[PDB]
Amino acid sequence: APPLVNLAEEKDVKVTVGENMDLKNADLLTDGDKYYLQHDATGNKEGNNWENYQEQGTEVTSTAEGKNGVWVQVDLGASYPLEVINLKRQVYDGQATIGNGNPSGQGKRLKGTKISYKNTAIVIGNEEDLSDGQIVYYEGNPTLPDGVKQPENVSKPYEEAMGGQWFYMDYANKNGLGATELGTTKEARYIRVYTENPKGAAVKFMELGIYGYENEQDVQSQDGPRRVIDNEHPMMIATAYSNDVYEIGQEEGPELQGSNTVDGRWNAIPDDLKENNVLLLHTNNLRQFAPDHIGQAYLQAFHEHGLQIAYEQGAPIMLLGLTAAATPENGGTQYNITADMDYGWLDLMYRMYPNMQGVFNTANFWAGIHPPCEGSAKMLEIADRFGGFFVWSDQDHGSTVTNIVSNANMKKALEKHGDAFYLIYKNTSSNQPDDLKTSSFFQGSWLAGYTGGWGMLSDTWAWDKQFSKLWQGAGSYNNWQRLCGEPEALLGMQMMSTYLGGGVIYTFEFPEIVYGTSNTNSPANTHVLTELFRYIVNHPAPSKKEIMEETKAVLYGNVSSDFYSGLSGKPTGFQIYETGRYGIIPVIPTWGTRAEVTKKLIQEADKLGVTPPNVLDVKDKNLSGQAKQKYFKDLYPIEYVGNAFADKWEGTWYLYNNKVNTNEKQHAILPLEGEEESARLKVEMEPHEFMIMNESGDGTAMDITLNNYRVNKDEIIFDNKFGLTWTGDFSPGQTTINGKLSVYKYMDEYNVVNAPEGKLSPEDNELRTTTFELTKLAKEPKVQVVKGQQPDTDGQPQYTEPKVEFNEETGKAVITIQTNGWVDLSITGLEFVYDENAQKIEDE
Ligand SMILES: CC(=O)N[C@@H]1[C@@H](O)[C@H](O[C@@H]2O[C@H](CO)[C@H](O)[C@H](O[C@H]3O[C@H](CO)[C@H](O)[C@H](O)[C@H]3NC(C)=O)[C@H]2O[C@@H]2O[C@@H](C)[C@@H](O)[C@@H](O)[C@@H]2O)[C@@H](CO)O[C@H]1O
Ligand SMILES: CC(=O)N[C@@H]1[C@@H](O)[C@H](O[C@@H]2O[C@H](CO)[C@H](O)[C@H](O[C@H]3O[C@H](CO)[C@H](O)[C@H](O)[C@H]3NC(C)=O)[C@H]2O[C@@H]2O[C@@H](C)[C@@H](O)[C@@H](O)[C@@H]2O)[C@@H](CO)O[C@H]1O
Ligand SMILES: [Ca+2]
Ligand SMILES: [Mg+2]
């Protein structure tokens, strides 16, 4: 029970009207129903047809000749601090037709004649006759109570809307229509609404919501940001997709994909990671294509129910604000019930639910550009007003940011609210090599100060575009099979590369694979995401200052996808690098001209007390095919030798094998700390492995964490040994397509961490070799397993004990270990001696 309530619903209200007015169905004014849906139990269809919009409400009819104006008054029974009023009257003159929307033949929109009421006013006070009345809203010339002055500024009529109209307690803020700071209240017992129907003596009041507090003590206040998102406070987002089943009034919380629940997903998060996690409520295909009355009812009911369950658990929430250009803005689609968003309702969710933090936008521009920018500009302002945030997820082929800023309203909203705005990549279209350019754009936007930060959405749909079985191409498998195919450790490699670039947001799909089903944690979540995210929570990423200090070159403009080849790495579609030598290579998109972006970057650098990096156009002669390698190699000295990825950040080495689906060993030769500069570690790894190494500093010891967790899908998914149905079709009496049910069944029965009787432990028992060669040493060093991933219930080990071989002649120690999972090693008793033959750390 949060402190802001609908007092009109909560209290035993009394409804009255004036002299020469008749009142019918007073109870409907405060019943919490704006839509009067009748077929919730059958998906809001009568047979195969969406239910018609039937407007019910409190009818007030003037019986005075020559005076069609009426009023209705609610007595809350006592005085309460009021913050928001929601007024809805009959929207349509006659009936709405369920008409064609966008796309044609699929999307439904109401069409008909909307009413523009006139002589509307809202007056509140503590006297039953409102002799002490305070004007909340005033349009036209309705006669106010004796003692109440006319306002100097009077409003003009508006068109009645599906969600009603929203009023606040500051008459100076757009004549009462302007959203106030949290906790802006006026005390009142009595709320009177004047209205004249342009046609006739009767007004139908569908709903009057009166939001306020039990007492002054409960009144809320804006107390800085709801969340900090930065290197010291990173954020993991998990998508909570509706399973597309919901009935207004249901007692149980909204069902999510894969038998998950909002509270169940929250309680699955390890306690020490909960403060760095959020849940994203996603309407998915819930009431997809529905006309306005059904779409808005379900968008609100689904999100409110989720928010309430999250509030009880202390779980912070983001809502999906916009996908597939499904916005109420002119030209929007109805691909999602986000098409029925009421900005006044979104404002109310921030006031009502202190755990409401953010809005998410993804995958719009395929379906339209300007309408989703118009919507995003409004929702970014709302989020920032309440100290919340806005996350935009997309891959940038070159036009994504340019499109965002091509919209005048979105450009202006970013100028004012940019610190609450975050861009994260989205590698779904892994076959288009824009992964590395997107990271550059999003890092550059943050670095120059256009945005609050950047991060990642790694999507296992990326596997589907290229690969199936381990080491193999996509072949002719069903896409739902290929979705299950991605190596778990590869998600950690992506998380490590985003971390090293000062990324602060981490998200993964498909959620039922990467996070889990049935309110359990998946193998990916248990053995990779929670393990590395804990590291990232406890070891801050580079700050903006730390990235700016280490950045020698910032690029401007539409960088070529393949620019990264010969520098940081060939774009794979999987958001990983061949080397950390050059970092991400920030590229500022066309937020402004090159000169404008340069002034912005210099001001940002100056605020941080750092030398501004040089800004080069992507077309600069230094950045040509033939010149870029010498140019970058001269700016950034080599830190290690080899074809594996390595980067040294804050005295720690970060490595991985960078082969996505080719079985090749790679190595990194690292110059080691301590008095003996000739000291070397050669690490050699097979694919799907990342490593964190932290030297004692004096040359005697090092700690190494490696993680190469990988489940084998070849037999259970691709050979389909359990005969799952992998198709995009529905079976009779199912609301979910067979391929998706097959993903859930795989995660529920065949791929279970700590598998109970009758379920299968993960196929993760085939081990792979890591070797460490240390030169040149006086004697054999000591290696031990400080801690290692333990068996599943099948009792099979995830690692073997490390073996050490020391050649006393060459002074080379070789440490060998076999793993599938994580191990923490400690190497001690190192005595390095001068090695005239040590690998030189220099370019070829
Ligand atoms: C032109 C183009 O291709 N546009 C891109 C879309 O195709 C992307 O949509 C996703 O496509 C997936 C296949 O690659 C898949 O169909 C997915 O829907 C299915 O999976 C999601 C989870 O990822 C949900 O479980 C859905 O319910 C499920 N569909 C069904 C019918 O069961 C698509 O993604 C969803 O739809 C888009 C529009 C967004 O709302 C996403 O957040 C959804 O998850 C799209 C996503 O990256 O990118 C476009 O550019
Ligand atoms: C008595 C007898 O012959 N024992 C058998 C073992 O030798 C088998 O182990 C595999 O042997 C292969 C050579 O004959 C090979 O070394 C293989 O490891 C290599 O391939 C795996 C494939 O994933 C990994 O890539 C390893 O990293 C790679 N090794 C190197 C040095 O690059 C061996 O399999 C591994 O080692 C065994 C002991 C187990 O730990 C497996 O989980 C590992 O994959 C063994 C399996 O075929 O069968 C015995 O009967
Ligand atoms: Ca195992
Ligand atoms: Mg009602």
- Decide: residue 12, CB within 10 A, 0-12 exposed, 13-18 middle, 19+ buried: exposed
Preceding omega of 776 cis (within 30 degrees of 0): yes
Q: Measure CA 328 to chain center.
A: 21
Residue 461 CA to ligand 1 center (angstroms) comes to 9
Q: 165 pairs with which residues across the strands? A: 87
The span from the CA of 632 to the CA of 580, in Å, is 12
In the block, tokens 């190497």 appear at 827
State how far the Cα of 139 lies from the Cα of 117, in Å rounded to an integer.
Answer: 10
How far apart CA 235 and CA 758 sit, in angstroms, is 36
Task: For residue 520, give the DSSP letter.
Answer: -
After which residues does the chain have a break in its backbone, defined as C to next N over 2.5 Å?
A: none
Task: Determine the 3-state secondary structure of 484 from DSSP.
Answer: coil
Long-range contacts of 540-544 (CB under 8 A, 24+ apart): 540/231, 540/232, 541/231, 541/234, 541/499, 541/500, 541/502, 541/503, 541/504, 542/231, 542/500, 542/501, 542/502, 542/649, 542/650, 543/230, 543/231, 543/502, 544/446, 544/447, 544/502, 544/604, 544/608
Structure determined by: X-ray
Query: What residues flank ligand 1, with Cβ below 6 Å?
Result: 241, 257, 284-285, 323-324, 362-363, 366, 426, 428, 461, 509-510, 737, 740
Atom 30 of ligand 2, nearest CA residue? 769
DSSP secondary structure string, 74-96? EEEEEEEEEEEEEEEE--BSSPP
The residues, any chain, with a CB within 8 Å of residue 686's CB and separated by 6 or more, are 657, 663, 664, 665, 708, 768, 769, 770
SS3 126: coil
* Single-letter amino acid code for the residue at 596: E
- What is d(CA 477, CA 464) in angstroms, rounded to the nearest whole number? 9
Cα(312)–Cα(600) distance, integer angstroms: 43
- Residues with Cβ within 5 Å of ion ligand 3? 764-765, 792, 796
Residue nearest to ligand 1 atom 9, measured at CA: 363
For residue 637, say if its preceding peptide bond is cis, omega within 30 degrees of 0: no
Q: How far apart are CA 559 and CA 555, in angstroms?
A: 8
Spatial contact of 115 and 198, defined as CB atoms under 8 Å apart: yes
Helix (DSSP H) and strand (DSSP E) numbers for the chain: 18, 36
Q: Is 629 helix (H, G, I), strand (E, B) or coil?
A: helix
**Which amino acid, 625?**
G
In this structure, which amino acid lies at residue 592? G
| H/E element, 402 | helix 400-406
Contact between residue 58 and residue 24 where contact means Cβ atoms under 8 Å apart: yes
| C-alpha to C-alpha distances, 193 to 65, 158, 798, nearest whole angstrom | 21, 15, 70
What's the full length of the chain, in residues?
A: 844
Cα atoms found within 13 Å of the Cα of residue 698, Cβ hemisphere only: 4
Output the CA 474–ligand 3 centroid distance in Å: 26
340 forms bridges with which residues in the sheet? none
What is the rounded CA–CA span in Å between residue 374 and residue 392? 14
Strand 389-393 relative to strand 165-167: parallel, antiparallel, unpaired? unpaired
Q: How far apart are CA 806 and CA 774, in angstroms?
A: 9
Judge residue 356's burial from the number of C-beta atoms within 10 Å of its C-beta, 0-12 exposed, 13-18 middle, 19 or more buried.
buried
Tokens of 156: 């003009």
Q: Can you point out the beta strands (E) in 217-296?
A: 235-241, 277-282
CB 521 within 8 A of CB 515: yes
Ligand 1 atom 48, closest CA:
363
- Provide the 3-class DSSP secondary structure of residue 576: coil
- Cα–Cα–Cα angle for 653, 659, 660, rounded to 5 degrees: 115
Q: Any binding-site annotation on 222?
A: no
Q: 3-state SS string over 1-17?
A: CCCCEEHHHHCCCEEEE
Residue identifier of the C-alpha nearest atom 16 of ligand 1: 461
Those residues whose C-beta lies under 8 Å from the C-beta of residue 719, and which sit 6 or more positions away, are none
The 8-class DSSP code of residue 791 comes to P
Q: Residue 768 C-alpha to ligand 2 middle, in angstroms?
A: 8
Closest-CA residue to 523 (of 711, 287, 255): 711
Q: Is 635 annotated as a binding residue?
A: no
Q: Measured at the alpha carbon of residue 364, what is the angle toward residues 361 and 369, in degrees to the nearest 5?
A: 115
Q: What tokens were used for 773?
A: 């060669």
φ, ψ at 534 (rounded to 5°): -60, -40
Cα angle value 529/534/540 (rounded, 5°): 120
Return the H-helix or E-strand segment holding 376: helix 370-385
Q: Is 471 within 8 Å of 199 (Cβ atoms)?
A: no
Extract the tokens encoding 573.
Answer: 């579609």
- Which residues lie closer than 8 Å to 551 by C-beta, 6 or more apart? 447, 583, 586, 613
Please state, in angstroms and rounded to a whole number, the distance separating the CA atoms of residues 315 and 31.
28
Task: Give SS3 for 268.
Answer: helix
Q: According to the annotation, is 495 in a ligand binding site?
A: no
- Residue 420, exposed/middle/buried by CB under 10 A (0-12, 13-18, 19+)? buried
What secondary structure does DSSP assign to 127-196, as a single string? STT-TT-EEEEEBS-PPPPTT-PPPSS-BPP----TT-EEE-S-TTTGGGTSPPPTT--EEEEEEEEEEE
Q: How far apart are CA 665 and CA 8, in angstroms?
A: 68
- Alpha carbon nearest to ligand 2 atom 45, residue: 766
* Separation CA 755–CA 768 (nearest Å): 23
- In the structure, which protein residues have their CB atom closer than 6 angstroms to any atom of ligand 2? 686, 766-769, 818
Alpha helices in 418-566 (DSSP H): 435-447, 461-464, 479-482, 488-500, 511-514, 523-524, 530-538, 544-550
28 appears as a binding residue in the annotation: yes
Mapped onto helix, strand or coil, the DSSP state of residue 795 is: coil
**CB of 629 within 8 A of CB of 567?**
yes
Q: Compute φ and ψ for 447, nearest 5 degrees.
A: -60, -40
User: How far is C-alpha 564 from the chain's CA centre?
Assistant: 27
DSSP for 185-221, written as a single string = -EEEEEEEEEEE-SSSSEEEEEEEEEEE-SSGGG---
**What ligand has the least distance to the C-alpha of 789?**
3
844 CB-near residues (< 8 Å, 6+ apart): none
For residue 559 the two structure tokens come to 């960088």
Question: Phi/psi zone of residue 189: left (φ > 0), alpha (ψ -120 to 50 degrees), beta?
Answer: alpha
Calculate ∠ Cα 584-585-590, nearest 5°.
120
| Alpha helix stretches (DSSP H) within 229-327 | 262-268, 292-313
Q: What Cα–Cα distance (Å) separates residue 465 from each residue in 274, 428, 492, 535, 799?
A: 33, 8, 20, 31, 32
762: CA distance to ligand 3 center in Å? 6
Dihedral (CA of 725, 726, 730, 735) sign: positive
- Rounded CA-CA distance 557/167 in Å is 44
Residue of 685, 765, 767 best suited for mutating to test ligand 2, as the one with most atoms within 8 Å of CB = 767
By the 8 A CB rule, do 226 and 153 touch? no
Q: How far is CA 494 from each of CA 303, 426, 435, 457, 585, rounded to the nearest angstrom?
A: 31, 12, 11, 9, 16
In sequence order, the β-bridge partners of residue 467 are 473
State both tokens at 113. Answer: 């004649």
Closest C-alpha among 495, 483, 488 to residue 439: 495
Phi-psi bin for 684: left (phi > 0), alpha (psi -120 to 50), beta?
beta
Q: Is 721 exposed, middle or buried (0-12, 13-18, 19+ CB in 10 A)?
A: exposed
Q: Is 56 left (phi over 0), alpha (psi -120 to 50) or beta?
A: beta
User: Residues 6 or more apart from 201 whose CB is under 8 A from it?
Assistant: 61, 62, 63, 68, 70
Sequence-separated (6 or more) residues with CB below 8 Å from residue 260: 240, 511, 512, 516, 517, 518, 519
DSSP string, 676-718: -TT-EEEEEE-SS-EEEEEE-SSSS-EEEEEE------IIIII
Q: How far apart are CA 554 and CA 589, in angstroms?
A: 11
CA–CA distances in Å: residue 649 to residues 236, 288, 669, 694, 744: 22, 47, 16, 10, 39
How many CB atoms sit inside 10 A of residue 746's CB? 24
- Supply 170's token pair: 């500051």
Cα 804 → chain centroid: 46
Q: Are 510 and 551 in contact (CB under 8 A)?
A: no
d(CA 89, CA 106): 29
Known binding residue 807? Answer is no
Structural domains of the chain ordered from first start: 5-218 (2.60.120.260), 236-615 (3.20.20.80), 638-711+764-828 (2.60.220.10), 719-750 (no CATH)
Question: Residue 352: enclosing H or E segment and its boundaries?
Answer: helix 343-352
Pairing state between β 421-424 and 389-393: parallel
Instruction: Tell me the C-alpha to C-alpha distance, in Å, between residue 366 and each of 332, 335, 369, 429, 454.
Output: 12, 12, 8, 13, 22
Contact 598, 614 (CB under 8 A): no
Residue 540 is inside which H or E element, if any? Answer: none
137 is annotated as contributing to ligand binding: no
Q: How far apart are CA 139 and CA 686, in angstroms?
A: 72
- Closest ligand 1 atom number to CA of residue 459: 23
Q: Angle at which helices 343-352 and 292-313 pack, to 10 degrees?
A: 10
Q: Which of 196, 256, 226, 251 is nearest to 61 (CA)?
A: 196
- The CA-based diameter of the chain, rounded to the nearest angstrom, is 114
Task: Report how far residue 35's alpha carbon sits from residue 180's, in angstroms, rounded to the nearest whole number.
Answer: 27
**Sequence-ordered list of residues with C-beta below 8 angstroms from that of 457, at least 6 positions apart, any chain:** 362, 393, 424, 425, 426, 427, 507, 508, 509
Query: What contacts 602, CB < 8 A, 6 or more positions away?
Result: 612
Encode burial over 588-625: b for 16+ CB neighbours within 10 A, e otherwise.
bbbbbeeeebbebbeebbeebebebbebbeeebeebee
